[PDB]
Curated annotation (Swiss-Prot), chain A:
Component of RNA polymerase I (Pol I), a DNA-dependent RNA polymerase which synthesizes ribosomal RNA precursors using the four ribonucleoside triphosphates as substrates. Involved in UBTF-activated transcription, presumably at a step following PIC formation. Residues 29-41 have a biased composition (Pro residues). Component of the RNA polymerase I (Pol I) complex consisting of 13 subunits: a ten-subunit catalytic core composed of POLR1A/RPA1, POLR1B/RPA2, POLR1C/RPAC1, POLR1D/RPAC2, POLR1H/RPA12, POLR2E/RPABC1, POLR2F/RPABC2, POLR2H/RPABC3, POLR2K/RPABC4 and POLR2L/RPABC5; a mobile stalk subunit POLR1F/RPA43 protruding from the core and additional subunits homologous to general transcription factors POLR1E/RPA49 and POLR1G/RPA34. Forms a heterodimer with POLR1E/RPA49. Part of Pol I pre-initiation complex (PIC), in which Pol I core assembles with RRN3 and promoter-bound UTBF and SL1/TIF-IB complex. The lineage of its organism: Eukaryota, Metazoa, Chordata, Craniata, Vertebrata. The gene is POLR1G. It comes from Homo sapiens. Belongs to the eukaryotic RPA34 RNA polymerase subunit family. The modification Phosphoserine is found at S26, S34. This is DNA-directed RNA polymerase I subunit RPA34.
Curated annotation (Swiss-Prot), chain B:
The gene is POLR1C. It is linked to Treacher Collins syndrome 3: A form of Treacher Collins syndrome, a disorder of craniofacial development. Treacher Collins syndrome is characterized by a combination of bilateral downward slanting of the palpebral fissures, colobomas of the lower eyelids with a paucity of eyelashes medial to the defect, hypoplasia of the facial bones, cleft palate, malformation of the external ears, atresia of the external auditory canals, and bilateral conductive hearing loss. Leukodystrophy, hypomyelinating, 11: An autosomal recessive neurologic disorder characterized by brain hypomyelination, delayed psychomotor development, intellectual disability, tremor and other neurologic symptoms. Some patients may additionally manifest non-neurologic features, particularly dental abnormalities and hypogonadotropic hypogonadism. Transmembrane segments: none annotated. DNA-dependent RNA polymerase catalyzes the transcription of DNA into RNA using the four ribonucleoside triphosphates as substrates. Common component of RNA polymerases I and III which synthesize ribosomal RNA precursors and short non-coding RNAs including 5S rRNA, snRNAs, tRNAs and miRNAs, respectively. POLR1C/RPAC1 is part of the polymerase core and may function as a clamp element that moves to open and close the cleft. Belongs to the archaeal Rpo3/eukaryotic RPB3 RNA polymerase subunit family. It is found in: Nucleus; Nucleus, Nucleolus; Cytoplasm, Cytosol. This is DNA-directed RNA polymerases I and III subunit RPAC1. Component of the RNA polymerase I and RNA polymerase III complexes consisting of at least 13 and 17 subunits, respectively. Pol I complex consists of a ten-subunit catalytic core composed of POLR1A/RPA1, POLR1B/RPA2, POLR1C/RPAC1, POLR1D/RPAC2, POLR1H/RPA12, POLR2E/RPABC1, POLR2F/RPABC2, POLR2H/RPABC3, POLR2K/RPABC4 and POLR2L/RPABC5; a mobile stalk subunit POLR1F/RPA43 protruding from the core and additional subunits homologous to general transcription factors POLR1E/RPA49 and POLR1G/RPA34. The chain holds residues 249 to 297 of 346 of the full protein.
Amino acid sequence: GGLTCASAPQGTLRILEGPQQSLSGSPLQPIPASPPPQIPPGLRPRFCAFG
Amino acid sequence: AAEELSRCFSPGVIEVQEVQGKKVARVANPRLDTFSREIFRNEKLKKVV
């Protein structure tokens, strides 16, 4: 138990978690565009001129 | 063109009728028209009325 000074280390291992990327890199999934306003069907001339 | 003329007016003023089998248009009771003036947006038929 003299606890002498040992030599300098050769290198460094570093352990850390890696993320999973099987999900991302996929084609994007955007929010679907709301439709442009379309005229309602069944619009008729309700007003007829008097006389 | 008679059907376009019938639709560019109020329902009732243009009587489109099959005389020969072909359709011709005539004014029938022009009191019904509201002057929407929609015939003036049809470029071909704004010269015939």
